[PDB]
Design a binder for this molecule. Structure first.
Ligand SMILES: Cc1cc([C@@H](C)Nc2ccccc2C(=O)O)c2[n+](c1)C(=O)CC(N1CCCCC1)=N2
Ligand SMILES: Cc1nc(NC(=O)N2CCC[C@H]2C(N)=O)sc1-c1ccnc(C(C)(C)C(F)(F)F)c1
Lengths: 1012, 144
């Protein structure tokens, strides 16, 4: 299993500066050797062999070069240490001992498998130990995607790999919303092109004014034009000179590793469009293509070492499953009367027949030996059919009203990955009931046995039909399937039905309605999710007809195909259509934006090898920016034992084929381990020490050589385009919060660091689940994209936040930003820890005095409006001066979104949000430019129109957000366990109402939350 | 409703506390299973070290007896004795953890027993409270 902690030994966070290590020599002798905790294995083996001469049989030992060390790690792994450059404290040994052995196996191959096991957070040798054929099949067969993706990277060497390593970061649309166009000087943008003249870092600039839609070569050619004009070339020689040279240079962003390698218009590149929004002139670096191509290492992808049937439809039998017995259940016989197994045959969340329960048996004797007969004909079983069962306790001690409670649950696919109907006996280790689950069955929970075999084990037995039963091939289903009522009454209803949100109930009539008109549903493709829920999945005839309709279904937008990947649509053909829609329409930009949800929905796939995981692997292996966050999002949830094997097996394959980026990840993974371990100490053993003693301990520790090498020279996991050089240790500090956050500052090693940022500031926080803040900042970013397309310049600030593991992650620091409170702390105290309302505007008046004042108040009021609407729709309460920040430039933004969707108030049954926005007055003063009667201004009226306009815009896209939350159900986030948690968005967006009743509803809630 | 909500909010608080102890105890049990797994692999390595030592000492003890170098034979015996001291010290460490795992794994079953008797009772209290469903006094009676 994975490590319990990040400590350098089992139960010890910090090795002593000197530690005694048991060395077991090959001649049988044992030598205790005092070693530095930071000592390399090279040094330690050398010192051992010096000491070994003092021991008997020392003339039997070969030279120290002929031996390597082996030991036991905290993951219970018997690891051979070939890469002897590693320091002692970073081996993460179980006990401080090393055995001296002759090395066995391939050096480079074993060193790789340790780097992978390190990056995954799980020893690779475990996958070699799983007897499961589906796992071994996944590990082998997935390499097709790896090799195929690697060939596509070496197809157009070296440009193709330059594209892989430094993909263009471009918007999905070259079109500028016209309010962005007018920020340009008649569509032209001024850019400063820099070139470094060797050797003195001599920086020469050529400032250009050019159209916003100029492609990089056109920008380059214009730079060459500016340079060469002074050299009296002939007019034609200049033409020939521009055409030849323009193709051989590239542009790079000053201060970071983002390059303009592709034919996009300059404004389509995200760095340029942002420069238009913020009004900053882009600083770019011109670079010869050979200079970049030399920096690109060759990605070596090596193939690893491990590289009579009856049809389902001929079975004339009903489905029956035998519940044999359970090993044990933890119930007190005095309080629980009896127990039973409750079963159901499900397709997704919908049951295919009546649920069947076993007879009741005594608690102490959980054995049933009972054949359960189900209301489904075996040929009518859909492919994603699943048995959902649980052991339920019943106590009738409250009267004639019995108590039923779930004890432990487990779900199983009735067909394995080989399209075979399950047969014979099977043992299913059950899962504990989730905290708060009162349902007797858990079909949305993971399907499959609990890897923890120390749990209640329920024995099942499936039927046997004298032969292996296989699901029919697609040709048979289609062939079997092949064997003007549409008035406007029906046409208007079909459109109204498709527009209803995914969480609206679809009545049994409407289910019948869409199915009868399934063919006109083709003429309205977005209705496919609604129609799919209307099929009789317990009828192969209707499913077959549905399969044929899907085979020719028009491709739908990506944001609608994602819904067909959540827990509601388990059928492989439905998902297959969904993945094909993504291959066709999902830009690498949008993929990055929805990368979290696409990783989450992997938990609902029936099998390890599927079309979605292959599409995601290929995309990750051909775009390193996608592949980076594909890694961490998979990585950050390896702690979750419900998927750790699936994600572990996947992370193995990505790491084996991602090329040289694995090395950069190893730097990041190890850099984080030092931070986790250090924070563990600060949070645990030194929890009672003062700020000073901890700060001393902090400065003491990072100064240690192992810490210096680990935490310097790596890529920011928040954004790998930022290089983290040396630590600016004077600026590193532990923050006052009791979770002991770590404010870290690095040097920017880019030669143009002074033009972008010479300091990279990151907050490392151990002890808080950041998945909420990740999702909120993701949602905030999408709301801004919508508002911009509809012409609403609401400046949000979705700063970087990345959960990297169990309640541990990173936050991008926003420079020149201060909480409202930090701004308020200027002239003294008012009341019980409270402050003055006018101080905020008074401060902002000083920061942006003169002509910038109107632009700053405008930026504030625009930025304030977006967060007001965003926090309302998402139900993020408790917004006050501590979690609202304002930049010196005037942009307001919210922080710390730990809990949303009204889950703090769910325990009370009172659904009425009336907390007064504490900072209503303070912000009104700014919007009103300092008026005494703030609410009477015309500017305030403009502010209200933005919020009304922004609110309806999001209401117009309610299906997208509902789907995004729906795709997150398997994450185990506390505020997101059922669709009922997601239903709060239905209330805030007033989807049961009309646009007029909704806006009035909004205006009401704002007034209920008005003056604070 | 005041009587039933207070009864509800206590068992709610106790089920939450027990669930914290339950999951916390569960993570600890896994670690003990890990360390026992690591101890087994470590014990296996040391036992090999003893077996290999007897092979090499075999012909040298024979040589050092005949060569009258009794002082060298004590060297080999002293170190071999030092090995067995380490092995016994480590088997004891595994054994104490195995014993420790038994107490926590039994306590673990005891937490899940207490919750699984509180879990159905907690639902019923919601039913009785909800029967009472059909403003200062409403937020007051709900434990505020
Ligand atoms: C200037 C200002 C004014 C308001 C409120 C008081 N008024 C409005 C705001 C928009 C549109 C109409 C009105 C109106 O009352 O007609 C406000 N905010 C700033 C916020 O920043 C956050 C916030 N809430 C509300 C509750 C959920 C958190 C966010 N409300
Ligand atoms: C994006 C961001 N930017 C910041 N800026 C400074 O802290 N600044 C900005 C400049 C100086 C310094 C300050 N004195 O004030 S804080 C921050 C942030 C956003 C969201 N969550 C956090 C937490 C919850 C992890 C925190 F702070 F509690 F750890 C921090």
């Amino acid at each position: 299993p994975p490590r319990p902690s990040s400590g350098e030994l089992w139960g010890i966070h910090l090795m002593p500066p000197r530690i005694l290590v048991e060395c077991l020599l090959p001649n049988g002798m044992i030598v205790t050797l005092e070693c530095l905790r930071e000592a390399t294995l090279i040094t330690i083996k050398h010192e051992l062999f010096k000491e070994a001469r003092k021991y008997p049989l020392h003339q039997l030992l070969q030279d120290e070069s002929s031996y390597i060390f082996v030991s036991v790690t905290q993951e219970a792994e018997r690891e051979e240490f070939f890469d002897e450059t590693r320091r002692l404290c970073d081996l993460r040994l179980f006990q401080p001992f090393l055995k001296v052995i002759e090395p066995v196996g391939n050096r480079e191959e074993k060193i790789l498998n340790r780097e992978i096991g390190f990056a995954i957070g799980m020893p690779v040798c475990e996958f070699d130990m799983v007897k499961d054929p589906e796992v071994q099949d996944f590990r082998r067969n997935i390499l097709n995607v790896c090799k195929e993706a690697v060939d596509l990277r070496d197809l157009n060497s070296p440009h193709s790999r330059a594209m892989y390593v430094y993909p263009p970061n471009v918007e999905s649309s070259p079109e500028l919303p016209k309010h962005i166009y007018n920020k340009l000087d008649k569509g032209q943008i001024i850019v400063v092109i820099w070139v470094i003249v060797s050797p003195n870092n001599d920086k020469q600039k050529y400032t250009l004014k050019i159209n916003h839609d100029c492609v990089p070569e056109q920008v380059i050619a214009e730079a060459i034009r500016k340079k060469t004009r002074s050299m009296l070339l002939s007019s034609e020689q200049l033409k020939l000179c521009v055409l030849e040279y323009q193709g051989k240079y590239i542009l790079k962003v000053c201060g970071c590793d983002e390059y303009f390698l592709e034919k996009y218009p300059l404004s389509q590149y995200k760095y340029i469009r942002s420069c238009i929004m913020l009004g900053r002139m882009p600083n770019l670096m011109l670079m010869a293509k050979e200079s970049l191509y030399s920096q690109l290492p060759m990605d070596c992808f090596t193939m690893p070492s491990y590289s009579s049937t009856k049809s389902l439809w001929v079975i004339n039998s009903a489905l029956r499953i035998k519940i044999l017995c359970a090993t044990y259940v933890n119930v007190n016989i005095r309080d629980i009367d009896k127990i039973y197994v409750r079963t159901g045959i499900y397709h997704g969340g919908e049951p295919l027949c009546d649920n069947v329960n076993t007879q009741r048996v005594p608690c102490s004797n959980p054995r049933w030996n009972e054949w359960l007969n189900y209301d489904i004909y075996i040929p009518d079983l859909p492919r994603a059919a699943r048995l959902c069962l649980s052991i339920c306790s019943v106590k009738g001690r409250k009267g004639a009203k019995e108590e039923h409670c779930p004890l432990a649950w487990g779900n199983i696919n009735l067909f394995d990955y080989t399209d075979t109907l399950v047969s014979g006996k099977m043992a299913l280790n059950l899962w504990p009931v989730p905290h708060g689950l009162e349902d007797l069955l858990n079909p949305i929970g993971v399907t499959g046995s609990n890897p923890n075999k120390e749990t209640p084990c329920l024995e099942l037995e499936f039927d046997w039909f004298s032969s292996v039963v296989k699901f029919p091939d697609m040709s048979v289903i289609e062939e079997h399937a092949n064997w003007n009522e549409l008035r406007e009454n029906d046409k208007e209803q079909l459109k109204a039905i498709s527009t209803r949100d995914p969480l609206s109930e679809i009545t049994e009539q409407e289910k019948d309605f869409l199915w009868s008109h399934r063919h006109y549903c083709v003429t309205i493709p977005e209705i496919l999710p609604k129609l799919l829920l209307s099929v009789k999945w317990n009828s192969r005839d209707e499913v077959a007809q549905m399969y044929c309709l899907v085979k020719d279904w028009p491709p739908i937008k990506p944001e609608q195909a994602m819904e067909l990947l959540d827990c509601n649509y388990p059928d492989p053909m439905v998902r297959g259509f969904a993945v094909r829609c993504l291959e066709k329409y999902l830009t690498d930009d949008k993929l990055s934006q929805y990368l979290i949800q696409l990783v989450q929905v992997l938990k609902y796939e029936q099998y390890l090898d599927n079309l979605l995981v292959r599409f995601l692997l290929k995309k990750a292996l051909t775009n390193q920016r996608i592949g980076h966050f594909f890694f961490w999002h998979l990585k950050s949830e390896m702690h979750n034992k419900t998927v750790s094997q699936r994600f572990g097996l996947l992370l193995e394959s990505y790491c084996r084929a991602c090329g040289m980026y694995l090395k950069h990840l190893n730097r990041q993974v190890e850099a984080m381990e030092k931070l986790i371990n250090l924070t563990d100490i600060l949070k645990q053993e030194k929890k009672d020490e003062t700020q000073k003693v901890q700060m001393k301990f902090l400065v003491e520790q990072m100064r240690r050589p192992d810490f210096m090498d680990a935490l310097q020279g790596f890529l920011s996991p928040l954004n790998p385009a930022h290089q983290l050089g040396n630590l600016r240790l004077e600026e590193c500090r532990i923050m006052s919060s009791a979770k002991r956050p770590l404010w870290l500052n690095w040097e920017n090693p880019d030669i143009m660091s002074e033009l972008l940022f010479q300091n990279n500031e990151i907050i490392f926080k151990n002890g808080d689940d950041l998945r909420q803040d990740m999702l909120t900042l993701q949602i905030i970013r999408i709301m801004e994209n919508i508002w911009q397309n509809q012409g609403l310049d609401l400046r949000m600030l979705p700063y970087g936040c990345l959960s990297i593991g169990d309640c541990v992650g990173l936050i991008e620091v926003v420079r020149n930003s201060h909480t409202i409170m930090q701004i308020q702390c200027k002239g003294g105290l008012k009341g019980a820890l409270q402050f003055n309302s006018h101080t905020l505007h008074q401060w902002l008046k000083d920061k942006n005095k003169g002509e910038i004042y109107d632009a700053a108040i405008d930026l504030f009021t625009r930025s304030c409006a977006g967060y007001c609407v965003a926090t309302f729709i998402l139900g993020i309460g408790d917004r006050h001066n501590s979690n609202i920040m304002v930049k010196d430039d005037g942009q307001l933004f919210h922080i710390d979104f730990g809990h949303f969707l009204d889950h703090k108030k769910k325990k009370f049954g009172y659904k009425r949000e009336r907390v007064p926005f504490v900072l209503t007055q303070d912000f009104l003063i700014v919007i009103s430019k300092g008026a005494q009667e703030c609410t009477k201004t015309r500017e305030f009226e403009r502010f209200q129109e933005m919020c009304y306009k922004a609110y309806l815009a999001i209401r117009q896209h309610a299906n997208l957000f509902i789907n995004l939350f729906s795709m997150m159900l398997g994450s185990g986030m506390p505020e997101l366990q059922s669709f009922d948690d997601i239903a709060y968005i239905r209330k805030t967006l007033a989807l049961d109402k009309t646009e007029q009743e909704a806006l009035e509803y909004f205006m009401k809630q704002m007034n209920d939350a008005r003056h604070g | 409703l005041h009587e039933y909500n207070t009864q509800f909010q206590e068992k709610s608080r106790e089920y939450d506390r027990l669930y914290e102890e339950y999951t916390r105890t569960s993570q600890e049990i896994q670690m003990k299973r890990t360390a026992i797994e690591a101890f087994n692999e470590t014990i296996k390595i040391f036992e090999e070290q003893c077996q290999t030592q007897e092979r090499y000492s075999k012909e040298y003890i024979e040589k050092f007896k005949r060569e009258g170098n009794e002082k060298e034979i004590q060297r080999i015996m002293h170190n071999y004795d030092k090995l067995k001291s380490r092995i016994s010290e480590i088997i004891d460490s595994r054994r104490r953890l195995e014993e420790d795992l038994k107490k926590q794994a039994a306590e673990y079953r005891e937490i899940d027993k207490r919750m699984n008797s509180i879990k159905p009772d907690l639902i019923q209290l919601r039913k009785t409270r909800d029967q009472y469903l059909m403003q200062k006094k409403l937020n007051e009676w709900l434990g505020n």
